[PDB]
Every structure is written in C-alpha cells, then in structure tokens.
C-alpha cells in the first residue's frame with residue numbers, strides 16, 4: 400500500500 | 410542467481426553509474442528570494458518531491474539494486490533518501506562557496522537558513538561538506554560511487570549487498586589509480602571520502618527530525634510520497 404511499492408515497479 | 414553487477418569491469422561500473430545520473434531539476438521561475446519558512450520550505454518540498462521520482466528510477470539503475478527483493482529496495486530507499494538528496498545538493502553546490510545550489514535558479518545562503526528555526530545549523534553542516542568536497546577536488550565519477558554506497562549501505566544493518574559494496578570500493582580505487590594517485594594516496598583518499606559519509610548520515614538524521622517537526626506544524630504541504638518516506642523513519 401506504499402506509493403514506493405508502486406513506483407519501484409513502474 | 411549470480412548478479413550481473415559483480416561481472417562488470419570498473420570502467421563499466423563507472424559508465425553505468427554516470428549514465429544513471431538523474432538530471433538537475435529547476436525550481437519555480439519566480440525570482441523572489443525566499444525569506445520565510447513558508448516560502449523556503451514550499452520550494453524545498455516541491456523540489457524534493459520531483460527529485461524523488463528521478464531518484465527512484467536512478468536506484469533501479471544502480472548495479473545490484475535490481476537483484477534485491479522489492480521489500481529490500483523499499484527499505485534501502487526509505488533509509489537513504491534524505492542522505493541522497495543532501496549529497497546531491499552538496500555536490501551541486503561545490504563550485505559555489507557559501508551557497509547551497511538547490512537548483513540552478515535557486516541558491517540559498519545561510520542568512521536564508523536563519524529564516525527557519527533550526528535550519529541554519531543544517532545549512533552550515535551542508536556548506537562545510539560542500540567546502541570539504543571542493544578542497545578535496547571530488548570528481549564526478551567519485552561522487553556517483555559515493556551516492557551508490559549510501560543507497561546500499563545505510564539500511565543494510567536494519568551478503569549480496571556487501572559484495573556489491575566491495576565492487577564499488579574496487580571502482581573508487583580504480584578511479585584514483587587512473588588519476589595517478591600513489592598507493593598511500595589511494596587508501597587515504599578512500600578513507601577521507603568514506604568518513605564524510607558519517608557526516609552525511611548525521612545531516613540526514615538531524616534533517617529528518619526537522620522535517621517531522623515541520624510535518625507536525627502542518628503549514629508546509631507534504632505530498633503523500635514525502636509523508637510515507639518520512640513516516641518510515643518513525
């Protein structure tokens with residue numbers, strides 16, 4: 400649920 | 410699964426890191442020199458917010474980082490982000506004695522740092538660091554190695570990472586040898602550079618305390634991303 404979790408994937 | 414990072418030559422490691430460098434972002438085009446908490450922290454927040462996106466994509470390009478689990482990458486970035494913003498700032502400010510180059514169109518002096526309770530001390534620390542870099546004649550290739558070390562080292566204690574760190578040490582030495590330094594000069598310079606990382610850590614810690622304070626004060630808007638990065642330091 401961390402934004403960082405998403406950004407690191409993209 | 411063997412990491413591609415360790416198979417790189419020194420020159421290749423250096424090329425990879427130079428190529429991964431984020432660009433230097435600008436601040437707003439308003440030429441008003443900030444002389445208040447609101448103005449200054451407003452501009453610093455916006456800049457930090459944008460730099461973070463470039464930092465995240467930079468980290469993915471640091472050899473070895475990609476071999477980490479997602480959770481480990483998150484932890485390393487959470488621990489290190491302020492140190493990384495700060496060393497970047499110090500590096501950009503080198504050629505500007507007495508000045509902090511937050512952006513090419515945003516240079517702050519210590520007299521402006523005084524505009525935030527508790528800021529001038531951190532400004533002075535940053536300026537002393539920039540001055541140190543300058544008198545050492547720190548090179549761009551050296552800078553990128555140091556930034557990568559911070560990424561990988563800062564959250565490490567909270568084997569692959571260590572091997573990668575050694576690889577970066579090898580690369581720093583390679584650079585000093587390439588530049589003609591004697592053996593003694595190499596180990597001394599290595600030591601000097603790495604000791605500055607202690608101070609960069611210190612500045613991050615103090616800054617984090619200051620940002621939490623500002624967070625609680627709640628006038629300078631913080632993005633959800635910055636809040637999460639900050640909350641990670643509890």
Ligand SMILES: Oc1ccc(-c2c3cccc(C(F)(F)F)c3nn2Cc2ccccc2)c(O)c1
Nearest residue numbers: 453454456457494495498531616617619620635
């Ligand atoms: O490109 C950059 C580099 C650093 C910062 C930065 C600070 C510089 C000096 C003192 C402080 C502190 F507030 F911690 F004492 C700094 N914090 N930050 C990051 C930041 C600033 C405002 C809101 C959220 C994070 C920078 O802003 C950009």
